[PDB]
Amino acid sequence: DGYKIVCYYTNWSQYRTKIGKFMPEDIQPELCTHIIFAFGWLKKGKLSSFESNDETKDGKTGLYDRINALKKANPKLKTLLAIGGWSFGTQKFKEMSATRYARQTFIYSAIPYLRDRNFDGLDIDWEYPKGGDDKKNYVLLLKELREAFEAEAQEVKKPRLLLTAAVPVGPDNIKSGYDVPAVASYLDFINLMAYDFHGKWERETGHNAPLYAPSSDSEWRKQLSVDHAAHLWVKLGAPKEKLIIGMPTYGRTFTLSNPNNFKVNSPASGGGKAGEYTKESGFLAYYEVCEILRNGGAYVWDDEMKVPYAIHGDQWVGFDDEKSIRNKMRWIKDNSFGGAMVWTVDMDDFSGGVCGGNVKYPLIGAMREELRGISRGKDAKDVDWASVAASV
C-alpha cells in the first residue's frame, strides 16, 4: 500500500574504495519498499549470476543472501533480480526473445533461480529494444514471463513473483522499441529511468534529470525532461500508478569551453574530469558532488528546470539535491504516479558523513519522507547549499 520506494543496488559498488565502499549491510531495511539487485546475467540462454561473489558457496555468504537478509529485519521488504543494464548489451536479449523456445528456456530457468535464492521478482533492463522485431518480441517475453509467474504462483501456493522493467525516457527509443499498452499491461510496475537526459555525448551543458526543460532548449530538446517523459508514457497507454519515477543519486558532468560561460546550454569541450571513487569521466556520485560543494564549488539553482548544478573552475555538474528531490516527490504526488525509483542506493550519502547534514541517506530519506511520511530523524535538516557553498 502507498507510494513505492524502489532502490537499485549495484554489486560493483562492492569494489569502491574509502568513502566509496558500499556493502548490502549499509542499506537500512526500512529505507526502501523494494530493492533491485543489479545485475543478474545470462548463461547459455538461462538466468545466472554475474560472478561467484553474488552466490553463496562453502560457508561464504554471497551478495544475494546479504541483500535478502534485510528482509529478516523488514519482512515487508521486496527484492527483485535485474537482468540487463549497460554492460549486458542487446544481442543476448535479441537471442533470448527471438523464438518461443529461447524465451521459454529463459523463463523456466528464471523461476527456480529466483525461488531458490529468495528473490520476490524479476526486473528486465533491456537497453534497449529497437526495431519492429525487438518491439514485438519484447512484448512476447514480458507476456510469457507474466503468464508463467501467474501459473507458478497458483501451483506452489506462494505470493506471485513480480515482473518489472527499467524503461527509457527518450521519445525515439520509446517509439522504436516499446509497445507501451501491452508492456504496461504485462508488468506489475514500471521503473522509468528518469535520468541521463543529458551528458558528455552532447556539445553543450545539460542537466542529468531536469524536471522541466530550460527555455534555451530547442523544440526537440524540450522533450527531454522528467515531466514530458512520464506524461509521454501515460499518453502511450501506461497507467499512472504503475509508473515509478527514477531519481539519480548521481550527476552528469562537463568541462566548460569557457569557465565564464557556466549556465545550462553553455559550450562544453567534453565530459567532466573523473571522480575519485566512481572513476568515470562525465559521471559523479552524489557524495562526490557534495565534496565539490564543500571545497570551493559554486551552487546554482535552476528554477526553470527545478534542479541544481555545481560549478568548480571549468567543471560543471548537473545533479539532484534534497530540494530538487523533494520538489520531484511533490510532483510525483501531484501527478498520481506510483512512487520513486532510485539509481542508486549506493551513491547517496549512505554513511551520512560526507555532505555535512549528518543524515544517512539524505536523498532517499527525503523521498521516503515526502511519499510515505517517515521522518529521517529529529534533527535531520536538508543541506542549504546556497548558504553553504559559493555563489556565481
Numbering used by the authors: 91 to 482
Paper lines:
Here, we report an arthropod-conserved insect chitinase belonging to group III from the pest Ostrinia furnacalis (OfChtIII), which contains two GH18 domains that act without synergism according to enzymatic assays and structural investigations. OfChtIII contains 987 amino-acid residues and is composed of four domains: a predicted TM domain (residues 7–29), two catalytic domains, GH18A (residues 94–461) and GH18B (residues 530–889), and a CBM14 domain (residues 922–976). The two GH18 domains of OfChtIII possess similar structures and substrate specificities, which differentiate them from the chitinolytic chitinase OfChtI-CAD. The degradation activity of GH18A and GH18B (or GH18B-CBM14) in combination towards EGC was equal to the activity calculated from the sum of the individual activities, suggesting that there was no synergistic effect between them.
GH18A crystallized in space group P41212, and the structure was determined by molecular replacement using human AMCase as a template. The structures of the complexes were determined by molecular replacement using GH18A as a template. These structures were resolved to resolutions of between 2.0 and 3.0 Å and all data-collection and structure-refinement statistics are summarized in Table 2. A unique loop (residues 145–152) is adjacent to the α7 helix. Additionally, a substrate-binding groove with lined-up aromatic residues is located on the surface. Secondly, the structures of GH18A and GH18B are very similar, with an r.m.s.d. of 0.88 Å for 344 Cα atoms. Although the overall structures of GH18A and GH18B are similar to that of OfChtI-CAD, with r.m.s.d.s of 1.3 Å (for 367 Cα atoms) and 1.5 Å (for 360 Cα atoms), respectively, there are obvious differences between the two enzymes. Firstly, GH18A and GH18B from OfChtIII do not have the same surface hydrophobic planes as found in the GH18 domain of OfChtI (characterized by Phe159, Phe194, Trp241 and Tyr290). Secondly, both GH18 domains have shorter and shallower substrate-binding clefts than OfChtI-CAD. As calculated by the CASTp software with default parameters, the volumes of the substrate-binding clefts of OfChtI-CAD, GH18A and GH18B were estimated to be 1628, 1399 and 1100 Å3, respectively.
